[PDB]
Amino acid sequence: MSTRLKIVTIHQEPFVYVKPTLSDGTCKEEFTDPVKKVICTGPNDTSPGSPRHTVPQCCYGFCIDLLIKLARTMNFTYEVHLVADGKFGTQERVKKEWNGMMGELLSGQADMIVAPLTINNERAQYIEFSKPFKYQGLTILVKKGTRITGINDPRLRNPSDKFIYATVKQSSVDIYFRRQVELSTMYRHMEKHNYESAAEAIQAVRDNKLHAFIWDSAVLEFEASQKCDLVTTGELFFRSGFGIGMRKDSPWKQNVSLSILKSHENGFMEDLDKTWVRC
Amino acid sequence: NHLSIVTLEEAPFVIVEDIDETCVRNTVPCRKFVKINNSTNEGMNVKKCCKGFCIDILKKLSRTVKFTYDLYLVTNGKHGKKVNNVWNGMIGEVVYQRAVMAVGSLTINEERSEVVDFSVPFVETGISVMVSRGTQVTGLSDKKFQRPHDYSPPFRFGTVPNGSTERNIRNNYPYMHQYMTKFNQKGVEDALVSLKTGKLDAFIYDAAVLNYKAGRDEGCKLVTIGSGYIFATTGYGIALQKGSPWKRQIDLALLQFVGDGEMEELETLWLTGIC
Numbered sequence: 001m002s003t004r005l006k007i008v009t010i011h012q013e014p015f016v017y018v019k020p021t022l023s024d025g026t027c028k029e030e031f032t033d034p035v036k037k038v039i040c041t042g043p044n045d046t047s048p049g050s051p052r053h054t055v056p057q058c059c060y061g062f063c064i065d066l067l068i069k070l071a072r073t074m075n076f077t078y079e080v081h082l083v084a085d086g087k088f089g090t091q092e093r094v095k096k097e098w099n100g101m102m103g104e105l106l107s108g109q110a111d112m113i114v115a116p117l118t119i120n121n122e123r124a125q126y127i128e129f130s131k132p133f134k135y136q137g138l139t140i141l142v143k144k145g146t147r148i149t150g151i152n153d154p155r156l157r158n159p160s161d162k163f164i165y166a167t168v169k170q171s172s173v174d175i176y177f178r179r180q181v182e183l184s185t186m187y188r189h190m191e192k193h194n195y196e197s198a199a200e201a202i203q204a205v206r207d208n209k210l211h212a213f214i215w216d217s218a219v220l221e222f223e224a225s226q227k228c229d230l231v232t233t234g235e236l237f238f239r240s241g242f243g244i245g246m247r248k249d250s251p252w253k254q255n256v257s258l259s260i261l262k263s264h265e266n267g268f269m270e271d272l273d274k275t276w277v278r279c
Numbered sequence: 280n281h282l283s284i285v286t287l288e289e290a291p292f293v294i295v296e297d298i299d300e301t302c303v304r305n306t307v308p309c310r311k312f313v314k315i316n317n318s319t320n321e322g323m324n325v326k327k328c329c330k331g332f333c334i335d336i337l338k339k340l341s342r343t344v345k346f347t348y349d350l351y352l353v354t355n356g357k358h359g360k361k362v363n364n365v366w367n368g369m370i371g372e373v374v375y376q377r378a379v380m381a382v383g384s385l386t387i388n389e390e391r392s393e394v395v396d397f398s399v400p401f402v403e404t405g406i407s408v409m410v411s412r413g414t415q416v417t418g419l420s421d422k423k424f425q426r427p428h429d430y431s432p433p434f435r436f437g438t439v440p441n442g443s444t445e446r447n448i449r450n451n452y453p454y455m456h457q458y459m460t461k462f463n464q465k466g467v468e469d470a471l472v473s474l475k476t477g478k479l480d481a482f483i484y485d486a487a488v489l490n491y492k493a494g495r496d497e498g499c500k501l502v503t504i505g506s507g508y509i510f511a512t513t514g515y516g517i518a519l520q521k522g523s524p525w526k527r528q529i530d531l532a533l534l535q536f537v538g539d540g541e542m543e544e545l546e547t548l549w550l551t552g553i554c
């Protein structure tokens with residue numbers, strides 16, 4: 001007996017902060033106004049091909065504030081968990097299979113995806129995306145001192161083992177560089193250096209391991225505003241939106257979108273942007 | 280397969296021209312019903328030519344989604360206004376099934392979404408504020424807009440009513456709205472002239488149109504406050520009948536156009552400016 005919604009999310013600052021619980025299994029009461037926090041069960045152990053031990057964790061950020069607003073608006077009960085494999089989600093050949101939160105949602109392990117999940121053709125062929133709650137693009141994260149003109153820079157268009165540039169494995173950035181033949185040369189360099197997570201990639205730019213990180217501007221711009229040793233370069237390419245993901249059959253699809261439109265019109269979405277996003 | 284499509288002129292999205300004796304270059308044929316006189320319902324469909332950003336989008340969706348169309352310009356209202364729970368404009372055309380879809384500078388909003396289905400947004404818009412360069416306003420939240428009579432003389436500002444902008448101001452800023460109605464403008468062109476000739480201080484309007492207008496302003500006098508800042512961000516979408524079988528293929532083709540860099544090609548071709 002349960003008409004409670006299974007919500008899947010991923011660790012992605014500043015949208016989803018993931019921190020451990022206190023010694024009693026509760027969240028450290030923080031303040032912006034109180035910081036609204038949820039219990040999010042997830043694997044404590046990263047690394048591929050390793051056993052995943054589900055532990056309660058604390059979840060907060062732009063997307064959590066958004067979920068709470070969605071639950072209160074549509075009158076739904078929910079429970080939150082982090083994506084077991086730590087990925088956003090691509091369709092790979094095994095017969096083809098979706099991995100990450102995409103795989104999770106399509107199998108019924110999740111009833112909803114609440115994360116900075118990019119709306120794209122490949123995913124929209126299989127799932128329902130709400131109206132976007134954020135419009136953003138792709139940019140490049142370099143170390144303060146590195147110079148690049150953008151996506152048309154010869155250090156990227158003409159790759160070499162000298163300058164290492166990557167993205168996140170099983171992400172939409174991976175889907176974009178793979179689908180486009182005009183970027184096949186760049187995709188061939190990237191495939192060898194792609195990280196399991198954006199945090200790992202961001203740290204690798206801090207530790208001189210990675211020299212350029214092609215990622216979502218909403219995340220890169222936020223990162224550059226905190227970590228002054230890193231800066232974003234060039235304008236925005238593949239301008240895309242972030243949306244809520246549901247199965248095509250979902251009875252919440254029309255109401256999820258109306259709530260998002262409401263929040264854009266009444267300033268709520270601009271509030272989240274001020275609270276969580278905006279050297 | 281052969282769809283009735285409604286549009287409305289608004290440059291650079293929809294541009295209407297007179298026929299050459301057919302439609303030339305990048306123009307598609309569009310009809311407009313023109314009344315014989317004002318004391319009859321009798322009229323005739325005049326053959327015209329349509330081009331612009333949204334017309335190129337239609338041409339691409341026609342080819343990709345594999346449909347043919349009969350494009351017409353709305354004559355009852357403009358974009359869409361619900362009067363006594365009865366929609367006019369492009370929205371009304373779709374609601375009352377005279378059009379399978381509406382293509383144009385059509386803003387996605389919550390109340391319109393209740394009566395029509397929208398495609399994914401394909402142009403970022405919302406509310407922007409145009410002023411002569413040097414006007415000290417922080418944006419819609421500025422006390423010059425919020426409490427205009429706290430100023431001697433008061434700030435003179437208006438919008439073109441009956442569209443999504445006035446609806447948003449009516450809903451969010453009740454005092455600002457009732458104050459604004461004396462500065463209502465017949466259209467964009469009138470509004471820009473009033474600004475340029477000191478009859479108006481600020482023009483509150485659709486972000487995408489205002490940014491295009493600022494980018495093409497002669498002498499670059501007129502600007503949008505902030506780096507072309509957008510309040511109540513939303514987008515332009517194709518409006519379709521509730522539960523339309525065309526929505527799916529149309530969303531997929533639009534997201535395909537973004538993936539392939541076809542969107543940026545149109546944005547470069549139609550929307551880039553000097554200023």
Ligand SMILES: Cc1ccc2nc(Cn3nc(C(F)(F)F)cc3Cl)cc(=O)n2c1[C@@H]1C[C@H]1C#N
Nearest residue numbers: 119131132135241387399400401402403513514
């Ligand atoms: C290509 C494109 C162009 C404009 C655009 N503008 C908004 C602006 N916008 N629009 C809304 C609205 F909810 F009204 F649709 C919310 C926001 Cl943010 C969101 C958005 O995602 N855009 C997109 C991506 C592909 C489409 C998708 N999905």
Ligand SMILES: N[C@@H](CCC(=O)O)C(=O)O
Nearest residue numbers: 358385386442443444485
């Ligand atoms: N694009 C607007 C028209 C202009 C406006 O009222 O801001 C709409 O669809 O209503």
